[PDB]
Each structure stands twice: as C-alpha cells, then as structure tokens.
Curated annotation (Swiss-Prot), chain A:
UniProt protein name: RuvB-like 1
PANTHER family in alphabetical order: RUVB-RELATED REPTIN AND PONTIN
Cross-link (Glycyl lysine isopeptide (Lys-Gly) (interchain with G-Cter in SUMO2)): K214, K434
Similarity annotation: Belongs to the RuvB family.
Main location class: nucleus
SMART domains registered for this protein in UniProt: AAA
Organ and tissue specificity: Ubiquitously expressed with high expression in heart, skeletal muscle and testis.
InterPro entries (alphabetical): AAA+_ATPase, P-loop_NTPase, RuvB-like, RuvB-like_C, RuvBL1/2_DNA/RNA_bd_dom, TIP49_P-loop
Assembly and binders: Forms homohexameric rings. Can form a dodecamer with RUVBL2 made of two stacked hexameric rings; however, even though RUVBL1 and RUVBL2 are present in equimolar ratio, the oligomeric status of each hexamer is not known. Oligomerization may regulate binding to nucleic acids and conversely, binding to nucleic acids may affect the dodecameric assembly. Interaction of the complex with DHX34 results in conformational changes of the N-terminus of the RUVBL2 subunits, resulting in loss of nucleotide binding ability and ATP hydrolysis of the complex.
EC assignment: 3.6.4.12
Reaction catalyzed: ATP + H2O = ADP + phosphate + H(+)
Other noteworthy facts: High level of autoantibodies against RUVBL1 are detected in sera of patients with autoimmune diseases such as polymyositis/dermatomyosistis and autoimmune hepatitis.
Curated annotation (Swiss-Prot), chain B:
Free-text function comment from the UniProt entry: Induces growth and cell cycle arrests at the G1 phase of the cell cycle.
Full protein name: INO80 complex subunit B
Organism from which the protein derives: Homo sapiens
Domain of life: Eukaryota
Compartment(s) of residence: Nucleus; Nucleus, Nucleolus
Complete-protein stretch covered: 298 to 342 of 356
Zn finger limits (HIT-type): 8-39
Assembly and interaction partners: Component of the chromatin remodeling INO80 complex; specifically part of a complex module associated with the helicase ATP-binding and the helicase C-terminal domain of INO80. Interacts with RP9.
UniProtKB/Swiss-Prot annotation, chain C:
Lineage, broadest ranks: Eukaryota, Metazoa, Chordata, Craniata, Vertebrata
Physiological role: Possesses single-stranded DNA-stimulated ATPase and ATP-dependent DNA helicase (5' to 3') activity; hexamerization is thought to be critical for ATP hydrolysis and adjacent subunits in the ring-like structure contribute to the ATPase activity. Component of the NuA4 histone acetyltransferase complex which is involved in transcriptional activation of select genes principally by acetylation of nucleosomal histones H4 and H2A. This modification may both alter nucleosome -DNA interactions and promote interaction of the modified histones with other proteins which positively regulate transcription.
A Pfam family the protein falls into: TIP49
Biological processes per GO annotation: box C/D snoRNP assembly; cellular response to estradiol stimulus; cellular response to UV; chromatin remodeling; DNA recombination; DNA repair; establishment of protein localization to chromatin; negative regulation of canonical Wnt signaling pathway
Written domain comment of the UniProt record: The C-terminal domain is required for association with ATF2.
Tissues/organs with expression: Ubiquitously expressed. Highly expressed in testis and thymus.
Residues annotated as binding ATP: G63, Q64, P65, G66, T67, G68, K69, T70
Principal location class: nucleus
Mutagenesis or variant effect for D285N: Abolishes ATPase activity
Entry's family note: Belongs to the RuvB family.
Record-given protein name: RuvB-like 2
Organism of provenance: Homo sapiens
Length: 443, 45, 439, 434
C-alpha cells in the first residue's frame, strides 16, 4: 500500500453549499476565513474567465498555507493542470532565471485534444498479387491489386490493396508467418516479427517471436490526449525522428535547455487558436503554485510584474513565512513578507493564523488515524499539551516513534508512559537552542 | 503461401518424460531436455 | 462559451489612446480615461513613429506606481496596429546565460526593425484525375511521367519533368486528391480527397475529412506578405541551414561582420524596391533594472541609422543606479537621461478613479449598484487602485454563490473582509512579530 | 597476506549499533562505547527505516567535536546493511559546476529509493566445439560443451548469419539468451591457449562453464529510482550513469517515472524499498538549498534524511542571519534532534581499547592510563592518532608491547593544535599574514 506523507490527509476545503466553512471536514480543521477565501479562488479558477490574477498565502511557520494550497488542487481534481514549484528552482545552470519562470507559466496551461486511431494487424498467411484478364496494350502483364490474408485470435480475412504496397513488402523483410501492422491513416506497413506459433521450428533462432494479435484484424478507437503548451514549445524547439545529420548529431550530443524565442510562443498560440475555433481541442487554464516565494531574486520579481499582466497567464498562488526581511539581490531593502511593495500591490493577500490548544488536539487525532495508530485519551491529552508548549509539527512528529516503542514493549496503542519516554529521546528547536547557548564555547 | 506446421511439438526421448526438446545429444543423437535426461539417456544406451 | 488562449487580463480593456483628429485627448474613449497630459505626449511620439523618418528617438514615461505608465504603453501599442513591429521586454530579461548583455540589447533592437516583402508566385490548383510514372527496366534512373488535373470548368494533361516527379512520389499523391502546385518553387501541397471517387476503393490507406473540387481557371496567382525582422535575417545568415535557431533561441553572440553585411544588403533591397524597411518600437518596462554597462551601451547604440524608436517606463525616485554607488533620477545615469524626452504622469481623483472602475466592470461582465460603486471608489483611495480593481471579480463570485444578479454593497464589504490590502496585512504582521521569520 | 583495496581507517571497528532486542544499548558491543541515549534514538529511527511506511522523515544529530555523530551514522548504516539503499554525501558536494544545487539534492534523494523487480530468464553458456553449415536457405548445426555435458543444436537461418558476423570458432566460450536471440562471446577456453603464438590486441582466457547447459530461472533485480530517471533522459542516456555527464533531467520525466512505479506496485509487478540519505557536515548547505529541503521532505516517495552538524548558534550561509546549528528555523521544526554528550575517562579508556584491538596493538596498563590523560587534556582524536605512531616507534626499538616511554617519544614529536598554536605565537612575526 501507498506510503504516508506530511499532507496525506488533506482531501478538500470542506465547505457547505453556501460556501461557509465547516469546523472539521475533508481532513482540514479551523482557519475558516482562509478556507472560505480559498473557496472563492477555486470558483475563480473554475470560471475560465481570467488570466494572471494572483494570491499570496501569508502567515507564520506551520499554520497551514501549504495544506490549503494542496487542498485547492483536490477541489479542482486531476483534469486541470496544477504545477508546483519552489522559489529556489529558478537558479538553473543551463538557462536564465526569467526563462525558468516563463516555462512554468506555460506548464500551467493545458490542451485536451481528441482523435481516432485505426490500424490493421495480424499474421500474414498469403501474399497474392492478382493479374487482370488482359494486360494493357503492349504490356506483358498488369496487376490490379494485391491480396493479403491476415489472421488473429478472433478470425481471418483478406485485405485488398494497391499494387504499390508490394515495394514496401520487400523493403521490410516480410515473409509468410510474420505478424505485421498497417496504419490506416497513412498506408505504411511495418513488420513486428515471426509469430510465436513457429518458436519450435529450430533449437535456436536469432529472432524474438511475438504472440498472435487478439481481437479483430481491423481496429478503431477514439482517444483523448492532453498536453501542456510547454510540451508544444519544447517539441517544436528541438525536433525528433531524425534521418539527417542535423538531427542525429543533435541526438548524440548532450541535450540542454535553451532560451525558447518569443516568436515560437507566438506561432504556437496562433495555431492552437485555429483548432479551438474549429472545435477540435479544448483549453484548460490551470494553476501555478510558486511555493517559498521569498527565495526569488529582485530580477525575478521585476519580471513577474510583466508576466502576471499578460492576457495568457495562469492563476498564480504564492506563499511566504517571512516578516520584514531584506529582498534577495539588494543590499539593504527591507520589505513585508520578503517581497517588493510594487509586486505586493498586485496580489490579493489571504492571511493564515496560529492554532489554539483544542485545534492542535483535533489535528493530532486526524494524523494518528491516518498514519494507522491507536492512542488512549490520557496520552492524547499529553501530546496536545506538548504541542501547545512547542509546535504542531514536533507534537505530530512523535506519533510514529511512540507507536514503535509501544510495539517493542508489546502494546497495540500509545499510552502516557510512551510519549513521556519519546520526549526524553528527541529534543525540539526551542530546547536544542537552549543547550547550545549554555555551551557556546564548544561548537 | 503458408505451409502448415506439424501437429505435436517434439518431446524428450527418455520414455517417461513430458518436456519439449531443448537440444540433441552429441553422441547418441537422441532428442533431450535437461542434464537429468542426458545422464539417463547416456546410462541406458 | 468557448475559451481561447487569450483571456481577460490586467490591461485587456485598453484599445488605443482615444485622441481626436486634431490630436487632443477625449475624457473617456477607447478604454482610457483621465491622464490628459501624458496621453497628448504619447500621441506626438506615436505620430513620430508612424512617419519613420528619424532614427534613435527615445522617450521615458515616469510617475507614481499605479498611474497608467504601462497602460499608456499598451494604449499606443494597440493604436500603432499589428503590421508594425512593437517589442516588449522587462529590464530583467537581458541577463542571459547564453550571450552577453550588449548582445541581448543588440538583438532586442534588431528584432524591432521590420523588412517587409511582398511575394507573388503562380500556382496550379486542381483535382488529380490520373498519374502515370514510368521507371526503367534497369537503366540510369531517368523516370518519366504524365499527370492530369481537373476543375469544375476545365481539365488538362501535363508532361512531367524529372526533378518534379520525385516530389509527387515523395508525398504519395494519388487520383482523387486535390492539390496546389507552386511552379517556381517545385513544391506540392494537398487540400484533401474529393468527395466522389473514394467510393470506388481498396482496403483503407487513408481516413480523413473530404474537401470540394476547385472552380474556374486551373492556373492562378497567389500573394503573400512577409514581415521579417533584421534579427531573423542575421540568424538565417549566421550559418548554413540555421533555421531552427529562429524558434530554439540557440544562436549566441552573432559575428559583427554578418550584421554589417546585412545592413548593406537591406539598403540595396530598399533602393531596388524589392523590400520595404519599416521602423518599429522597443518598449523596455522597469528599465531601472539595467546595469551601468547596459546604459553605457545604449548611449552609443542609439546613434545608428538603423535604430528603432525606444520607450521606457519607471516608477523610481532618486535611487542608486544598479551595479554602482551613484544616486541619480529614475535610477538612470545622466549620460542617457540627457539623450531623451521625459513624459510624466499624475495621481488620480475620485472622479476618474470611479470612471476607471466603471470601464473595468464593462470588461469583466459585471453589474453593480451606484451605492456599491460609491463604496468601492472610497476603498480605491483609502488603498491603491489595483486593489479596488481586484475586488470586482471577488465581489461578482460571492454574489453569484448566493444566487444574486447584481453586486450589492454587502458583497463588497464581505470580500473586503476576506482578502487583505497590503497595508492591513502589514499591520497584522506587527502583533505576531516573534512568530514570522527574520524580522 | 595480500593488501586488499580497503584497509583499516577511522570508523572501521564499528560493525553495527550495539542494541538488545528491546533496543536497550549495551555498555560495550559491536565496537561502540557509551552514548546510550543517542544509541536508543538511533535504534528507534532504524526501526522506522526498516518499516518504510512513512515518507519524508528527517533526523538531525548534533553535539560537540569528537563525540560520535558520524560514528553513530556509520554504525547505523551497517546495522541496516546492504539490500536497502544508503547514500552518504558531504554537504559541500552539491555545489556542482554542471547542474544546480536543486538538481544535486534531487538526485541524492532519488538515489536512495530502490525498486525490486522479478524477471523470468533462460540462458545458454558453454564452450563451442564445432560449427557446421551446408548449402542446399542455409542449414547448419552447432555443438556446445560444458564440463558436465556435450550437446548439439539445429540452428536456423538468422543464427547462421549471426555466428559468421561475430566470428565464433572452436574453443570460444559464448552465451545466448534464446528469448532475445543475441550472441555474446566471453573469451577463449584455457584448454586452447596455444593454437596461436601472437594473439590479437584483446583476447581473454576463461574457464569452461559447468552444470546444466540451458539454465532456466527467476532472477530478482534491485535498481535505484535515479537510474530509471537517467535512462529516460536521452537516446543513449545509460552512458551517463558512469560518466556523471547528465544535465538537469526534465521535470516531466521524473513525474512520469513516479506514475509508472506507482502503477507497478498496484499491479504487484514491483515493490518500493525506502532507503536513507545521510548528509554529513550539513551546516554548509546554503539558504536556497535549505528552502528546497522544505518541499523535498513532503513527497509520497522520499528517503529518511539523517544530517549531522557540529555548529553552535551561527550565521546561515548565503545570509546575515544567526540561527541554531547554522540551519533555518523553518527546517529545524520539520526535523527531530538527537544530541550527543562528551565522554568520561571510563569511556575514553574503552574506546582506546577497541582501537588497539582493531589496529592489532598491545599496550601496558600504564601506557593506556597515560594515553587516557593525554586524550582528555586534548582531543580524543589525537589520542587515537598516537597509538599507530607508538607502535611504529616500538617496532624500531625492537620491542613488542607499547610502553609509557613510547607514548612520551611520540608525544614529543607530534604536536596537537593547542601546543602548536602556542609555539606559533612565540615567533609570530616570522609567519605570513597576521
Ligand atoms: N488546517 C489544517 N487542518 C489539518 N491539518 C493541518 C492544517 N493546517 C496544517 N495542518 C498540518 O500541519 C502541518 C503543517 O502544515 P503546513 O501546510 O506544512 O504549514 P505551513 O505551510 O504553514 O508551514 C502539516 O502536516 C499539515 O498537513
Ligand atoms: N488612464 C487610465 N485609463 C484606463 N485604465 C487605466 C488608466 N490608468 C491606469 N489604468 C489601469 O489601472 C491599472 C494600473 O495601471 P498600470 O499600467 O498597471 O500602472 P503603472 O504601470 O503606472 O504602475 C491597470 O489595470 C490599467 O489598465
Ligand atoms: N561511541 C563511540 N564508540 C566508538 N568509537 C567512537 C565513539 N564515538 C566516537 N568514536 C570514534 O572517535 C572518533 C571521532 O568520532 P566522530 O563521530 O567521527 O566525531 P564527530 O562526532 O565530531 O563527527 C572516530 O575515530 C570514531 O570512530
Ligand atoms: Zn526429459
């Protein structure tokens, strides 16, 4: 079964139909105004009206801003792209900072486009070039068509084909008892190998045999294929399927990202609009979640001023835990949240708040019953108390090690005497710093 | 045109043995399937 | 219903500058309101750009944050039309890993001068009635053939050359296809199968949408207009078969000798009447990002007869020029600031702040009461204009959730309590001073 | 006798992490002494590693120099053993000249998760005795030997071609996989090492195979999740496994691999083995790299991290800011901290005893006593370094057991930091730069 992580319980925002928050629902507890706010943002993303609008979740360490951002992705579900990033990802060795941001802005926009596939396949039982009764004038013989007899686990039938197929059927080393396929939209033929039926005809042969096709000789299906605009950017900027020196040299060489030009972005925008107009393809504008924003550089922020104002951009969600820090890439310029004031003017802030002693107790129970652990009430009333003296993360951190110690001492549930033993093994940030300060001459 | 395969796949020569032929013996010319059957063929011929 | 790739964004409502024929700004038109002084000046530099006579003219737009600096630049970019190159850059975007700063600016300049080439060629366009290809029984490979083409009015037969036959056979054209042949280029192109003959067919080699037969004269002329920047002409000429670098962006530090050679050849095409040169504009937003090395390049780069018109915008007081110790106006050194004309912008009043909100709700498809506009306008002066603009969608959504059909004042008071302004956020950050990081 | 490529070093005598079945630490076992409280904690996290139920866990080991932090991690790595990945790096190794600090950390994570797969095989492996062919399509036969049997195959057409391309001859030892068909020479039989007397630039002699000629079986392969990412980076990417030359794997590839591995564990085709990543000297990761760990420790598949550090309250690299351990607070509360304690005289004797048993040295009880004082007036690590030198002086003296005088000779020749830095002050103006 799947492993457990620091957000595995977050299943949604947990709202009424009226859009008011519930005290505890879909794995979340508390933060009601911030959850109500994210409710509005989910409707904004589902509306498909808007571009470039952005929100900053602001609040101290361990208050739920990452959890809430993840919850929005649950409300939207799998069909619309949600792209996570951290501020520290922009500093690549291959490519400039502003290109990393621009790629991510194009990852968070999807196409869904749908098309038929048709193919013929089977073991070839016969190749029967068919002559006309008389040749054309002056000629010795004339062939009107080839018959190919294909068989599969479901049956057998003849296909009748244009004489020009015959050249291809000797470029490929096709012989009777091979299995082949023909792409019905293109007319090309490809060999797969000798059928598995014949695997016994020598003690050794230097070919891998392939099993007989199952289902009909002629196959059809409709499939829906989904791609980001960033995938179209890259596939056009470095082509594939080389039969030329430029391609093959380019494919033996070490691949590296490159600064994709604004012309290519332009041309891709022009053609996907033609397909959207013709009803061939559906756009799904998505979300970019830039976490840990306070790690971006002032050059990056000053690029975002242009990026967020573009008519194309996705919805952007930002997060930060900083107070009045200096902006990276400047010497002295302090600002709220570690962000420039003139970017912070372009975002709606959502504010996130510390938990009360009752709320922590309620979350620790939700962790235990998802991490697969049983706890007695007299132990939980100790662990929520430790949480109040220390931090939510540390009081949640003790659950699994307490369970392990309980199991080694032969019990099926955490008890008081377990948690007050684990607390003696592992310090926290607050208590460790005290130990350093009493001993500062020895580090 | 496709000539048909023979009916049964070739089996081991050792009389009680159901396994298919893997190889043939270098000396006696019998069809074989394992080191076990090779020792038995070599002892009984 | 259907959603295209371009949507509602921050400046989608602007559609020009709203000047009259005597170049005076109307109070509210083409989605711009107020700001009469700077809109007049923008009219004059736009007129200068359209004339095209004089190279290297530079303009700087200045003023407080949130007073339509970028809006006026977008305004003129709309008015100037699509047919004339207008390039936007934020000042951050020249700090490449692939090429030096002076190269990046040289590319941004040369990308903003267009060469416009009209091209005409003669095409044959018809439905394929038959194809004959004859191949030697051994021989040298000198294949020969005949092809026949039809329209609703005419049909005829073509005896086929040996260079041309490889194209038909490469692209596997067959009877029933409708095709367009460019005689000069020797390139085939296909429209699709005609509706009629696909009934009389083998097991399938193709399965695609049909198209109608062409009409009237079998031979016709085609015309295309290409606009090609000087930059892409430099890239094409930097190496044999270099075309992918126009999309890939892989071409680093182009040889000066190539550009000198192109500058000459472009002038010859002008005098020959083969191509039209068309000066455009480079807009560098947030220009105070440039290093003094970049400024020093601009000083002398701006003096060439191939230079485009340059526009810059900034929101900076007396500040230290990036990459140095020295304070200066706009954070630009005086060497450069002496070489240009400054246009300046003014803070808004009630009267025009309300009018901006009114023209914004028309674009986002919202109705509000006059009472709601009155409250929102106050918010938009207690706090910045962008924040007030940002409440309009949030108000519409909260309205729609409760099954309303017009935004009321309590919707706005609701939203205003839910999403913070910076000033309120920064205030709450004082009372939790120990709980946030690195104060 | 012969000196192998691995030989006696620092953390060499620790052969596990000495614990009873109740995870009570013994006073002295598996080559460790003292440090009881940290050794219990180490036991509990080792049990957590072995279960592998929960992802993204982290522990930090802290405490003064020469108190066993890397000893406990190097002990724990052996208690855990092979068959479970354990990747160790120094903090300073992530500063690559060909990929970002993010990628160096990303690969160090993806390198500590293993996938186990079953594979169903048959292979033939033997010395070739004779190849015979005739022209009526071609027809042929081929004979294989192994020490237990000699046997013949009635090979088909494409095999006849392939054997000519690969130029097999009698006395060559070869393998084939029948399912795939591909031939592969291993060398020539020692029994044939004389049918030439000037051999080509590379030919290699091997013993003739034994047992069954066509062995058929399951095999189980364990492969690190990182290699699946690298093989999918480019058209012949596997070369980069050895070359190191792989440049910022595109994000959509790692996502695709995670999807596929998740599918295989639901199908039961594969299973995921969580391992460990150890970063020693973590105090010199940079502020951008710390902010990446804040989201690396949150995936559905991440290792456990163990990190060790020696620093007090000190400035975080890449900033002005002071903090505990030189680590940001937004990471220190995702961690869980184990603290060492300085050693007593009692422990200092025992650990020196274990080093003399490992380095194969005898000492007088007086000599252990004198050495223990030196190792308590000055660092433990200095006393550990005196014993080899004391032995080498003893051998030159034609002794056998190290005496007090052998300690005092070495103590006169080799200085510690505190004696050295004092002598540097008595002549300071003769040295360069302050
Ligand atoms: N409102 C909540 N309801 C449930 N669990 C929460 C809530 N807020 C936080 N948590 C949990 O507490 C921990 C801290 O939350 P996180 O999102 O990482 O905080 P932050 O991003 O503010 O530092 C995580 O394990 C998270 O899943
Ligand atoms: N005079 C105006 N007429 C119309 N819209 C305006 C005007 N001035 C500003 N705006 C709008 O108000 C917002 C802020 O203007 P903006 O161009 O971003 O300001 P600046 O670049 O000066 O900081 C934008 O949405 C813009 O479209
Ligand atoms: N408890 C211990 N048992 C055995 N050897 C130890 C113990 N603690 C430290 N050592 C040894 O002492 C030396 C220093 O320990 P080490 O862990 O490397 O120091 P640090 O804690 O500063 O990283 C090494 O030779 C190590 O093997
Ligand atoms: Zn047998």
């Amino acid at each position: 079964t799947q492993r457990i992580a620091s957000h595995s319980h977050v299943k949604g925002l947990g709202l009424d139909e009226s859009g008011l928050a519930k005290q505890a629902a879909s794995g979340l507890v508390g933060q009601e105004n911030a959850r109500e706010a994210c409710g509005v943002i989910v409707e904004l993303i589902k509306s498909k009206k808007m571009a470039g609008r952005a929100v900053l979740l602001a609040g101290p360490p361990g208050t739920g801003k990452t959890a809430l951002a993840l919850a929005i992705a649950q409300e939207l579900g799998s069909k619309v792209p949600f792209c996570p990033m951290v501020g520290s990802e922009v500093y690549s060795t291959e490519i400039k900072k502003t290109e990393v941001l621009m790629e991510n802005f194009r990852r968070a926009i999807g196409l869904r486009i749908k098309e038929t596939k048709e193919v013929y396949e089977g073991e070839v039982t016969e190749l029967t070039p068919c002559e006309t009764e008389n040749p054309m004038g002056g000629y010795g013989k004339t062939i009107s068509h080839v018959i190919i007899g294909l068989k599969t686990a479901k049956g057998t039938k003849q296909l009748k084909l244009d004489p020009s197929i015959f050249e291809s059927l000797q470029k490929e080393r096709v012989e009777a008892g091979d299995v082949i396929y023909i792409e019905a939209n293109s007319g090309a033929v490809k060999r797969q190998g000798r059928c598995d039926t014949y695997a016994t005809e020598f003690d050794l042969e230097a070919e891998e045999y392939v099993p007989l096709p199952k289902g009909d000789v002629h196959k059809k299906k409709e499939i829906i294929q989904d791609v980001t605009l960033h995938d179209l950017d890259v596939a056009n900027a470095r082509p594939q399927g080389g039969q030329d020196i430029l391609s093959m040299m380019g494919q033996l060489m070490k691949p590296k990202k490159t600064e994709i030009t604004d012309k290519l972005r332009g041309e891709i925008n022009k053609v996907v609009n033609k397909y959207i107009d013709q009803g061939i393809a559906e756009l799904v504008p998505g979300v970019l979640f830039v976490d840990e924003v306070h790690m971006l550089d002032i050059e990056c922020f000053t690029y975002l001023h242009r990026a967020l104002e573009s008519s194309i951009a996705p919805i952007v969600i930002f997060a930060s835990n900083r107070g009045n820090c200096v902006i990276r890439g400047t010497e002295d310029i302090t600002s709220p949240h570690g962000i420039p004031l003139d970017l912070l003017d372009r975002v709606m802030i959502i504010r996130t708040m510390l938990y009360t002693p009752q709320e922590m107790k309620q979350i620790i129970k939700i962790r235990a019953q998802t991490e697969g652990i049983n706890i007695s009430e007299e132990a939980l009333n100790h662990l929520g108390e430790i949480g109040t003296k220390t931090t939510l993360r540390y009081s949640v951190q003790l659950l699994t090690p307490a369970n392990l110690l309980a199991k080694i001492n032969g019990k099926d549930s955490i008890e008081k005497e377990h948690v007050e033993e684990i607390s003696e093994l592992f310090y926290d940030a607050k208590s460790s710093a005290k130990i350093l300060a009493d001993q500062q001459d020895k580090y | 045109q496709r000539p048909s395969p023979s009916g049964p796949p070739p089996r081991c020569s050792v009389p009680g043995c159901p396994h298919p032929r893997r190889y043939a013996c270098s000396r006696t010319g019998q069809a074989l399937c394992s080191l076990q059957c090779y020792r038995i063929n070599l002892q009984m011929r | 219903d259907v959603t295209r790739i371009e949507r509602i964004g921050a400046h989608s409502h602007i559609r020009g500058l709203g000047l009259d024929d005597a170049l005076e700004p109307r109070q509210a038109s083409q989605g711009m309101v107020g700001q009469l002084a700077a809109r007049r000046a923008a009219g004059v530099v736009l007129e200068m750009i359209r004339e095209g006579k004089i190279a290297g003219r530079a303009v700087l737009i200045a003023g407080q944050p949130g007073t339509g600096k970028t809006a006026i630049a977008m305004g003129m970019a709309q008015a100037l039309g699509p047919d004339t190159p207008f390039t936007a850059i934020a000042g951050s975007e020249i700090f490449s890993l692939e090429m030096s700063k002076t190269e990046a600016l040289t590319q941004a300049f040369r990308r903003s001068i267009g060469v416009r080439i009209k091209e005409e060629t003669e095409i044959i366009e018809g439905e394929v009635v038959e194809i004959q290809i004859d191949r030697p029984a051994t021989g040298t490979g000198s294949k020969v053939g005949k092809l026949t083409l039809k329209t609703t009015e005419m049909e005829t037969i073509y005896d086929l050359g040996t260079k041309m036959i490889e194209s038909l056979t490469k692209d596997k054209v067959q009877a029933g296809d409708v095709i367009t042949i460019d005689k000069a280029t020797g390139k085939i192109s296909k429209l699709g199968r005609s509706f009629t003959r696909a009934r009389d067919y083998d097991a399938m080699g193709s399965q695609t949408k049909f198209v109608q037969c062409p009409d009237g004269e079998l031979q016709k002329r085609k015309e295309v207009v290409h606009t090609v920047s000087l930059h892409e002409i430099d890239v094409i000429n930097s190496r044999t078969q270099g075309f992918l670098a126009l999309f890939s962006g892989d071409t680093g530090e182009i040889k000066s000798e190539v550009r000198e050679q192109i500058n000459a050849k472009v002038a010859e095409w002008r005098e020959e009447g083969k191509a039209e040169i068309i000066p455009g504009v480079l807009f560098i937003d947030e220009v105070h990002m440039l290093d003094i090395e970049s400024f020093s390049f601009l000083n002398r780069a701006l003096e060439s007869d191939m230079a485009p018109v340059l526009i810059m915008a900034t929101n900076r007081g007396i500040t230290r020029i990036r990459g140095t110790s020295y304070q200066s106006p706009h954070g630009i050194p005086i060497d450069l600031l002496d070489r240009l004309l400054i246009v300046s912008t003014t803070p808004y009043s009630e009267k025009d702040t309300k009018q901006i909100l009114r023209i914004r709700c028309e674009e986002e498809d919202v109705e509000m009461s006059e009472d709601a506009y009155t409250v929102l306008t106050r918010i938009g002066l207690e706090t910045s204009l962008r924040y007030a603009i940002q409440l309009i969608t949030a108000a519409s959504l909260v309205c729609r959730k409760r099954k309303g059909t017009e935004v009321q004042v309590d919707d706005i008071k609701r939203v205003y309590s839910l999403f913070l302004d910076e000033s309120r956020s920064t205030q709450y950050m004082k009372e939790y001073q120990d709980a946030f990081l690195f104060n």
